[PDB]
């Protein structure tokens, strides 16, 4: 239950307080709240938890990896395919 | 005396009213049929408009986008006065400008269109190619004579 919320609440805040998150993930005490935040790489500063750190982090790790030349399709390559269908 | 005045109006310079006013205030007032006369106190009064009419030509070429606020102090007038005087020269085609009353911006420009940008980006790429090819000609010459 805690984990499913953590997946939804990435895209629903850029920052949200400690007090508001605590409630969402159904913790009774501070120690439980802060540990779940660190595993998700969300920093807690002045009792505010930031979704910006995971969301930026994930974005870079995608660009680091290779899938994306063909998946996106490179524009130069698109035209090559246009030409050679007619000539075939 | 005369060289300094004509050259200051001709060349592209950013300058303000009192600096110019100060330079020419004792000099041209002992010359009548110029600025000295009682009716030609409205040709010294004309002189103020004239230096700020030239500023707008200067300001438009060099500066594309500049704050309206900063522009007010440059012609040394209120915003109300400035905006009127920007308009006179957008109508007489001397400048093209867009002035915002909120004092966001004054965008001194003529707006390009989608085609003008595309045309301008063809020429950059065409003329580039020419420069690459002549360079190789001159490498061969330089080494051979050396």
């Amino acid at each position: 239950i805690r984990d499913e919320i953590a997946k939804n609440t990435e895209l629903s805040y850029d920052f949200l307080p400690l007090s508001n998150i605590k409630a969402l993930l159904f913790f009774n005490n501070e120690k439980e709240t802060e540990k779940f935040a660190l595993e998700r790489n969300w920093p807690i500063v002045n009792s505010k938890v930031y979704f910006n750190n995971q969301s930026k982090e994930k974005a870079d790790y995608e660009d680091e990896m290779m899938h994306e030349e063909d998946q996106k399709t490179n524009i130069i390559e698109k035209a090559m395919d246009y030409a050679i269908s007619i000539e075939n | 005396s005369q060289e300094s005045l004509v050259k200051l109006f001709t060349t592209n310079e950013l300058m303000r009213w009192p600096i110019v006013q100060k330079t020419y205030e004792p000099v041209l007032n002992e010359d009548d049929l110029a600025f000295g006369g009682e009716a030609n106190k409205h040709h010294w009064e004309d002189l103020q408009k004239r230096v700020i009419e030239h500023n707008l030509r200067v300001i438009s070429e060099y500066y594309s986008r500049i704050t309206l606020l900063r522009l007010n102090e440059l012609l040394d007038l209120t915003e109300s006065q400035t905006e009127t005087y920007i308009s006179d020269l957008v109508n007489q085609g001397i400048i093209y400008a867009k002035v915002n009353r909120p004092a966001k911006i004054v965008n001194f420009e003529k707006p390009k269109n989608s085609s003008q940008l595309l045309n301008e980006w063809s020429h950059n790429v065409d003329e580039l190619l020419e420069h690459i090819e002549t360079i190789g000609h001159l490498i061969t010459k330089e080494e051979i004579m050396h």
């Binding site: 130069i76 390559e77 050679i84 075939n88 | 060099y62 500066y63 986008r65």
Partner: protein
């Protein structure tokens, strides 16, 4: 002019210049403006986005460091043409008739 040439960008902020000439941000406006008039530089000046983006540098007599930076620019260029080329030789290899 010196500082923008060797950089591969062709614009500078006001904040860069303010540090560079060790003078106010107010001075920047007046000196950069003279640079257009003389024809040392040519371009557009903006105070709202706080940029001056040049479109020209004037020709100079070219000392040793300037030539090194000119070299490293063409090494970048050359490597691109080659990669863009390999991909297009492979795709439609058998069709060119």
């Amino acid at each position: 002019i010196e500082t923008v040439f060797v950089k591969n960008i062709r614009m500078l902020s006001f904040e860069d210049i303010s540090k560079a000439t060790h003078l106010p941000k107010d001075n920047v406006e007046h000196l950069v403006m003279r640079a257009i008039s003389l024809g040392l530089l040519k371009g557009s000046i903006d105070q709202v986005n706080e940029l001056v983006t040049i479109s020209w540098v004037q020709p100079r007599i070219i000392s040793g460091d300037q030539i090194t930076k000119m070299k490293d620019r063409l090494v970048e260029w050359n490597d691109q043409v080659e990669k863009l080329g390999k991909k297009m030789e492979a795709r439609g290899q058998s069709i060119w008739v």
